[PDB]
Amino acid sequence: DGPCALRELSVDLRAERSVLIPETYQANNCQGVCGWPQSDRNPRYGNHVVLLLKMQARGAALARPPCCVPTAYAGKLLISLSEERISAHHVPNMVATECGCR
Amino acid sequence: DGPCALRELSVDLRASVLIPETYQANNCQGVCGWPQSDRNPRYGNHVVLLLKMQARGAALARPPCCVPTAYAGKLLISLSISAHHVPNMVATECGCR
Amino acid sequence: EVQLQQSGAELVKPGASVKLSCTASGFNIKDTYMHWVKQRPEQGLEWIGRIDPANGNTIYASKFQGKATITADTSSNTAYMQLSSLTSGDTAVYYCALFITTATYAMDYWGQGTSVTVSSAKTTAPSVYPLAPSSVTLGCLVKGYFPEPVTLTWNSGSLSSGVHTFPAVLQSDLYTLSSSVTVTSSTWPSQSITCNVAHPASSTKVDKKIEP
Amino acid sequence: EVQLQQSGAELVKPGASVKLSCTASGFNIKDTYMHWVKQRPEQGLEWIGRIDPANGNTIYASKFQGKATITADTSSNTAYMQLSSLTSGDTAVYYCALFITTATYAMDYWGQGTSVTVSSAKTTAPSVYPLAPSSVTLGCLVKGYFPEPVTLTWNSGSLSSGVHTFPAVLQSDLYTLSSSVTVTSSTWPSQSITCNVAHPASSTKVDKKIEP
Amino acid sequence: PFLETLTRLVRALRVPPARASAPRLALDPDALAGALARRVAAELQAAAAELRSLATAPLLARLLALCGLGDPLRALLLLKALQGLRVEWRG
Amino acid sequence: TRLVRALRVPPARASAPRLALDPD
Amino acid sequence: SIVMTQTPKFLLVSAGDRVTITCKASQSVSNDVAWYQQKPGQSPKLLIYYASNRYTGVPDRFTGSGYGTDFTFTISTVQAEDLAVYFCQQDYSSLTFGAGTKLELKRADAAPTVSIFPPSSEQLTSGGASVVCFLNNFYPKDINVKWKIDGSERQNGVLNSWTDQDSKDSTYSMSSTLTLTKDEYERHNSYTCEATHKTSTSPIVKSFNRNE
Amino acid sequence: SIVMTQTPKFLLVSAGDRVTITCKASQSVSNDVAWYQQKPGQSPKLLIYYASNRYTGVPDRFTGSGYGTDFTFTISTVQAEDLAVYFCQQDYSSLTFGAGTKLELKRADAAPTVSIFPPSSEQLTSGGASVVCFLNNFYPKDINVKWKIDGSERQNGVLNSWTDQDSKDSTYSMSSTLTLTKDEYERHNSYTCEATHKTSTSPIVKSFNRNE
């Protein structure tokens, strides 16, 4: 498992009439565990996260412990083919590209 | 409990004498579902994709979580005179990713 | 949700062929393949083959090749398996399955299981007998029936405490079964206790009352 | 981690005063207040008072005012409670507690409990007796002792299956207790079974062997 | 006339796999709401040669022979689709 | 400093309001 | 001061049912309430703080809700490890700890096991004689125990003690003791211990004779 | 084809211990391995996938690890609801389902309860006579059962059936049956059923007589 990082997750898009390019739709996901002290490869934590971790270490019990989540995204473009018609679309914020727990 | 939103969480600083005393740092808490019943901005495409995967029948290893998305700085003063400024301390928005 | 429903138990002559079915529910079979699995009482699980409804390309193992044909129909979300050339070695339990495993998500759904038996005997009806003696034990005995499936209950299902039902045993192509119940000394013969036996194949229902 | 440790059980005359202690561990008492709680066998829980080590400002309930003084010492992370003017109505169990509840986090830690008894009797030592008769039941009887605390075990703690230990009962300023053990027919007298009684107040240890 | 043949070629090239286990899930695309003409010919010839490098040969021959219209979007979209197919086919 | 310390009188509430953490 | 009233005062379940408890307040208490659990011979442990949150380690079954002047605590599927006493506390003023609610389970009936032990030799040499009667593993709670000497009634000097519901099979127990002087004891010849319960139309009698 | 070897083939715990199982592969299988669970009379259910992740609803106790050519599955604190058979599957090629490992618990010994039932009137009118002997709630597994008629040995026509380990108290059971013709049954007078076990130096015998 290891610490918080990025990992693969892909699906296949299918249509009954048209054909889509590209077929394999790729959208990674963030997964792992981040602890204290930090043993990771991403940038340093913020002040909020270290405050929460210290609170957890003193003996308290929070109702929402820190979670590993992404912090950036990139767009994508799709093309659809069918008789007498080709179409293209551009959709932003689809592919995750970084992870860091908040 | 309700849906994902912001809620109070404060501590007291004690060491000199510090101003201000009550250190305020809110926290995000709640649950976000499908369809959206919230007051924050609309979800992204990634989150709706994950929710649709979860609804179809699959079982993800990291379901969406309610987290903050903004921060503000703060300034502290210590008397015995010193001042410090530290950024990214107070959460001010919530939205699940 | 998702649910997989199957057919009922089957008994077949040594040399005929069978056609088992597996129908989904709350799901579209075109999304992913369908696998057929076999289980024998003591040899563990095995793999027979898989089918892809969207295209129709099927794969079979290296041992079951040539004696198991898989087909699919998406008009009603159903799959069929035809098993041919039985040799009294195929008596087993068959399962319908969906499998997916990936680094970030997974799915696993199984059916309920279909029992296939191969023999040259003849169907027959059971015989039910009662048994009578600060505690008292009573028994209901089922003797001389075929094939295996049969159901036994006490008081139509209102007495499920301290009741044992022993597994069936076969000798001279005929089965047997027994059930026992223990009750305190202040509930008999002050009340009525009866054992009910139901055989579905012959469509027989019998109820017998225990008396001193 | 955090751990709260307390003193042992105490017995006092009707008119003296007591001083109970509560020491933390793995924590700094200056962080938050400390509460003292009382419990009676059937009247439920109650609240006595709280102390703030940093400043020394203490708060007491409206009923215990004037007969309970709380103090703290941060040099060794300890708190003391002095209870005065006993009237044979304070026989009870006392607890040391830390409480914090907030909309986003909470901390709750409790002690182990100290027992306080008020009586005008005199300490005495117990008397141990054995009892002898496809199963066999044996018993060990403890009679004529004071005060309540006492420990009973079978075979030094290597026989904890099918053993019952009935609660003590008081009549004429004297307690009583009994213990029973059931064992199969192929482990006696082929083996050795002994009951061990330990009274800490008088510092007495006794072992008795069951024989036919 | 021409696009339909390209669709047939694309469908033909996407042969089914032979692996014995499902690789991943399939989900329909219902959600997620939003003057050098020599370039296209050269790109088509290059892609045809690359596919030649390696059933489908007759379709490619028909495409090349078919080789009038001035819609700005169609040419650019076809160029992009061919650029994508360039990477896709190498698998 | 003395005035600030004097003005910060202790509270009279019977329950702990929140935790205390040193500015480290 | 705020006064908290808790209902119901007693409860009984069948290990598969849903349970609900209510705790009303005498004055607007905002949303400051806590729900605890106390097992026998142990200190309490927090379960639910504020009005909706859950402490670490609490499973999903437990839940609570309410606001203003009415609060409720519900368990969906009771299990065999949830025998304890539940309290509701408020914090808007000097703390108050409700009244407390018990809980119990159910099972099939059973009959007692009866044993009788006579006085030992050491006790006889001392000067007294104690006869012991143990009743084990019965259900339900109520029983009647009687002593007889030489076919006559005797109700002086008897001591009785009950045990709590077991956490392994939910069964009770009981011990009875009769004390006499040596001279009086040696004058009679036969002794008997009789038990009357719900699961038998006649008493269960265990007797012994001194001469042999 | 890849061949998977699973060890150990049998296991036994005391309801508080840790258990570890290993499943080795015959060739590099990357990190494609899954761990299942199958209770009696039910279809399997996934527990762990892709070597080290955990399906929805699996508690914290279970865990697994490994890579390359060695994989292990460990349970920290066994409970009473973890009686099943465990399989290890790979997916790098045509699926293979290991061999399977059982599991068992422990408890204190106990003695059997023996009952004997004679033939019914209807069966006698039919033409046969069956005598039944039930042994209930014993431990450990092994027993010897013997039939005697008119003080002589008889070992022809006997049928025996065993039950599986109970999920409520972990105890076995057994049934024995003897069949005879009406004339031969009526020619003799006395019948007996004897049981030999570990918890008794002498056999337990239950006998009946035809004349009364």
XYZ file of N, CA and C in Angstrom, chain A residues 10-61:
156
model
N -8.846 3.124 -14.823
C -9.276 3.398 -16.185
C -10.568 2.651 -16.471
N -11.310 3.150 -17.461
C -12.568 2.547 -17.887
C -12.602 2.517 -19.410
N -13.617 1.847 -19.950
C -13.840 1.762 -21.389
C -15.168 2.417 -21.731
N -15.153 3.294 -22.729
C -16.351 3.979 -23.195
C -16.893 3.275 -24.432
N -18.190 2.980 -24.422
C -18.842 2.256 -25.502
C -20.116 2.977 -25.907
N -20.390 2.984 -27.209
C -21.605 3.567 -27.753
C -22.228 2.592 -28.740
N -23.560 2.601 -28.797
C -24.281 1.668 -29.657
C -24.229 2.092 -31.119
N -24.096 3.389 -31.394
C -24.147 3.906 -32.755
C -22.806 4.465 -33.217
N -22.230 5.402 -32.474
C -21.003 6.064 -32.882
C -19.785 5.345 -32.308
N -18.605 5.767 -32.759
C -17.337 5.241 -32.264
C -16.558 6.396 -31.650
N -15.987 6.166 -30.472
C -15.331 7.210 -29.701
C -13.822 7.032 -29.742
N -13.110 8.154 -29.798
C -11.651 8.173 -29.758
C -11.218 9.198 -28.716
N -10.358 8.837 -27.752
C -9.760 7.520 -27.497
C -10.727 6.596 -26.769
N -10.522 5.281 -26.828
C -11.437 4.358 -26.164
C -11.191 4.321 -24.660
N -9.979 3.956 -24.251
C -9.668 3.801 -22.834
C -9.619 5.172 -22.172
N -10.580 5.436 -21.294
C -10.648 6.688 -20.557
C -9.854 6.533 -19.266
N -8.816 7.351 -19.110
C -7.874 7.254 -18.003
C -8.134 8.362 -16.994
N -8.297 7.979 -15.728
C -8.503 8.940 -14.648
C -7.918 8.320 -13.383
N -6.699 8.722 -13.036
C -6.006 8.138 -11.900
C -6.744 8.467 -10.603
N -6.240 7.927 -9.495
C -6.837 8.167 -8.191
C -5.741 8.195 -7.135
N -5.979 8.951 -6.066
C -5.027 9.055 -4.966
C -5.356 8.037 -3.887
N -4.319 7.407 -3.344
C -4.528 6.329 -2.390
C -3.283 6.159 -1.533
N -3.502 5.766 -0.281
C -2.445 5.486 0.664
C -2.771 6.080 2.017
N -1.738 6.212 2.849
C -1.867 6.736 4.205
C -0.715 7.695 4.465
N -1.014 8.840 5.077
C 0.011 9.800 5.463
C 0.031 9.924 6.979
N 1.222 9.794 7.563
C 1.371 9.797 9.005
C 2.255 10.909 9.527
N 2.761 10.741 10.750
C 3.561 11.755 11.425
C 4.708 11.084 12.172
N 5.976 11.411 11.871
C 6.479 12.410 10.914
C 6.312 11.988 9.459
N 6.449 12.932 8.532
C 6.203 12.651 7.125
C 7.281 11.742 6.552
N 6.852 10.680 5.865
C 7.731 9.840 5.047
C 7.039 9.672 3.695
N 7.227 10.651 2.814
C 6.528 10.712 1.534
C 7.500 11.245 0.487
N 6.963 11.594 -0.684
C 7.732 12.253 -1.728
C 7.057 13.508 -2.264
N 5.919 13.908 -1.705
C 5.198 15.095 -2.142
C 5.673 16.305 -1.347
N 5.201 17.511 -1.662
C 5.620 18.689 -0.893
C 5.277 18.548 0.583
N 5.799 19.483 1.370
C 5.587 19.461 2.808
C 4.130 19.752 3.151
N 3.695 19.234 4.300
C 2.341 19.481 4.766
C 2.122 20.975 4.996
N 0.857 21.335 5.217
C 0.507 22.671 5.644
C 0.472 22.779 7.158
N 0.090 23.964 7.632
C -0.022 24.176 9.071
C -1.282 23.529 9.635
N -2.377 23.551 8.875
C -3.617 22.948 9.349
C -3.439 21.456 9.608
N -2.779 20.752 8.689
C -2.652 19.306 8.821
C -1.760 18.948 10.002
N -0.657 19.676 10.191
C 0.211 19.385 11.329
C -0.506 19.701 12.635
N -1.308 20.767 12.661
C -2.096 21.046 13.856
C -3.024 19.881 14.173
N -3.721 19.370 13.157
C -4.631 18.252 13.385
C -3.875 17.016 13.856
N -2.716 16.740 13.257
C -1.943 15.567 13.651
C -1.456 15.682 15.092
N -1.009 16.871 15.501
C -0.617 17.058 16.895
C -1.805 16.860 17.827
N -2.963 17.415 17.468
C -4.157 17.202 18.278
C -4.459 15.718 18.432
N -4.338 14.961 17.343
C -4.581 13.524 17.404
C -3.550 12.822 18.280
N -2.303 13.293 18.255
C -1.247 12.636 19.017
C -1.343 12.921 20.510
N -1.807 14.114 20.892
C -1.875 14.459 22.310
C -2.780 13.508 23.081
N -3.815 12.978 22.435
C -4.750 12.089 23.097
C -6.184 12.292 22.655
N -6.451 13.393 21.960
C -7.800 13.698 21.512
C -8.243 12.690 20.453
N -9.489 12.832 20.006
C -10.074 11.941 19.004
C -10.949 12.788 18.088
